[PDB]
Design a protein around this ligand. Structure first.
Ligand SMILES: CCCC1=Nc2nc(CNc3ccc(Cl)cc3)nn2C(=O)C1
Ligand SMILES: CCCC1=Nc2nc(CNc3ccc(Cl)cc3)nn2C(=O)C1
Ligand code: FES
Ligand code: FES
Lengths: 359, 359
């Protein structure tokens, strides 16, 4: 039977092999929604070639590439198997992967969805918490695609544009935290500090009204509420690059600071990610948990397992799509409000693209 | 009958009359927990005398002084009346007001509680969301009082040090938002943007790991959950002072930004305050809603009523104390973890003061 409903899973993506690193970095630094550097179409290629060896070396240290596509695929397969049973009037369902910076690109996925002749298309961001830098840029690419080709879509579009507090997402995080708490020495379990580590944002993005920090904070609160506040916690921020101000405190300085103040039993939680990638496998697990932690005299530092192949996460994705379909929603209420200090004209056009869709 | 249980309600306070402004500013700029300044003991009286006319004029604009003491007293009386019936084994209950920067000062309240011979003393911060600059500095003052006086307490101490998601606090905000939504023209109700406006913090405090922004975000999420996401919202930050970086976006810039982008129907919500004071009556209601809003061409800008005399809020306070008593908690789990980049040694001493209390 031909596919009736397409679920486009949106992520920035990462290079699968060392050979993919250069083009990954090229697309990243060309992303005007992320950064407006001068002589962009010529300054970004210089940055890409200069940083490729360093970034190749990071991926070599975690096994040669990013696992994002593998995990996204497994999660999508499970989502589809459930949806075909959950929602037979919109079946058969097909998942598509739309990466921002590597193949398959969002634009290639849209071409395939259209070639498949879908009736309905769901832009399903894989970022639970919305940032203009993540979900916003992915959604812009969908709007831009139809604007560049100059023709209108042959499928009815809608988006699941955020889901920071979905009860099954929360249950997954709480399950992985408890599982990891069990791996500390029993005499130190109560002593463990839970560091929720989310990707940071430049302060210039925070200060123009990006909803990401507040939504990440809501995920943290719902998790800790499900855990009945069993351990103390803090929300800290990782992966800052460059010389500009970013939202802190930084994860690495917070680890170092806890250690120097007698808190040497630490549980890291990647609260803004749904699978492993360079920011967990390299930044948290190598740079912080092995190098920094040893330098500071950590007793035990562990990290909750990424959601990856947990079947409850696939259930969460299918439940989100099912509710989205039954409610006839085109987007969240939050998407109808663009950032108060937004300077990009595309954001309003992308918003209107989804709110005006024929049902 | 002799009072048995004292509830010390902690707030920064504000000057009741124009004559109180100078000493209010003096204590404010002498507070090393709130800000560090060179030669503070001679610099602060310079700043205090310089700023007194300006600040007296702000208070003149809202009727001659701060209403905080009035509202705190009404809230405390209602709390006590309920507690005497909720918890007769700890009755009679008596509330005490402990202001940081005006009379009655935290130190004066502690003296009175001790003189009254209470069996039990509860440090009940009136900030639902914890910052080291608000609740932390108030709790430090309790520890420092016993440290300076050289004696030990004659009453058993505990603290309710935060409550950002208490279900009755959330209901009060939701009720006031709905009531104010009804005062917009019906044809614009759906169009209203809800700006949750919380007092900002300097980035130097945020980057230390202060828990405030995450907890404020959690209050916002629970309110909007109760409101069923009926309107788009943003969390923005007010009351920045000085030239250093603070957490944004600023409330004033956000109002102006919305107006220039076509969102001319705005509901302000003071999400980190429990009553009116200068930041609502002057900054929000005069500086932003009358002057700024008129210059930008707002159609309707309103503000949810502060919780003030709402009897449901008094029920929330009594429910908090009652549950605190039943559970034998000395403090939240979160208080047992100091800021990872905290450089102030009193914070740990204060923490230990409460965790170590005889039950
Ligand atoms: C306005 C452009 C300035 C820039 N904004 C940026 N954001 C990021 C990473 N964003 C991110 C957030 C959450 C998650 Cl889950 C993953 C990724 N990198 N970056 C830059 O290099 C320049
Ligand atoms: C002219 C005064 C200089 C300063 N004023 C400051 N205010 C604060 C945060 N206060 C705060 C109040 C209420 C709430 Cl709900 C939350 C937070 N920090 N701070 C400084 O460091 C210096
Ligand atoms: S920047 Fe957030 S909407 Fe354009
Ligand atoms: S600064 Fe937060 S504990 Fe001292």
């Amino acid at each position: 039977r031909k596919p009736k409903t397409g679920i486009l899973m949106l992520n920035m993506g990462g290079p699968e092999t060392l050979g993919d690193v250069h083009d990954f970095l090229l697309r990243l630094f060309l992303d005007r929604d992320l950064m407006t550097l001068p002589i962009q179409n010529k300054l970004a290629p210089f940055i890409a070639k200069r940083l490729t060896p360093k970034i190749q070396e990071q991926y070599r240290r975690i096994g040669g590439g990013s696992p994002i596509k593998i995990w996204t695929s497994k999660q999508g397969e499970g989502m589809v198997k459930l949806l075909d049973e959950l929602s037979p009037n919109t079946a058969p369902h097909k998942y598509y992967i739309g990466f921002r910076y590597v193949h398959p690109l969002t634009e290639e996925a849209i071409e395939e969805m259209e070639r498949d002749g879908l009736e309905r298309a769901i832009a399903f961001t894989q970022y639970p918490q919305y940032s203009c830098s993540t979900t916003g840029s992915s959604l812009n690419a969908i709007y831009r695609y139809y604007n560049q080709v100059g023709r209108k879509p042959t499928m009815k579009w809608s988006t699941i544009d955020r889901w920071p507090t979905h009860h099954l997402l929360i249950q997954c995080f709480a399950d992985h935290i408890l599982k990891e708490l069990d791996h500390f020495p029993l005499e130190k379990r109560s002593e463990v500090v839970i560091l929720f580590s989310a990707h940071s944002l430049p302060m210039s993005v925070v200060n123009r009204g990006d909803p990401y920090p507040q939504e990440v904070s809501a995920t943290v609160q719902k998790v800790m509420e499900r855990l009945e506040y069993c351990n103390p916690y803090r929300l800290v921020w990782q992966s800052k690059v460059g010389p500009m101000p970013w939202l802190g405190p930084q994860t690495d300085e917070s680890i170092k600071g806890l250690c120097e103040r007698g808190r040497k039993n630490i549980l890291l939680v990647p609260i803004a990610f749904t699978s492993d990638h360079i920011e967990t496998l390299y930044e948290l697990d190598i740079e912080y948990s092995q190098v920094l932690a040893k330098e500071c005299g950590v007793e035990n530092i562990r990290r909750a397992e990424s959601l990856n192949g947990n079947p409850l996460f696939s259930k969460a994705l299918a439940d989100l799509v099912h509710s989205h379909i039954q409610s006839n929603e085109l987007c969240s209420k939050q998407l109808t409000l663009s950032c108060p200090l937004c300077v990009n004209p595309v954001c309003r056009e992308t918003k209107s693209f989804f709110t005006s869709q024929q049902l």
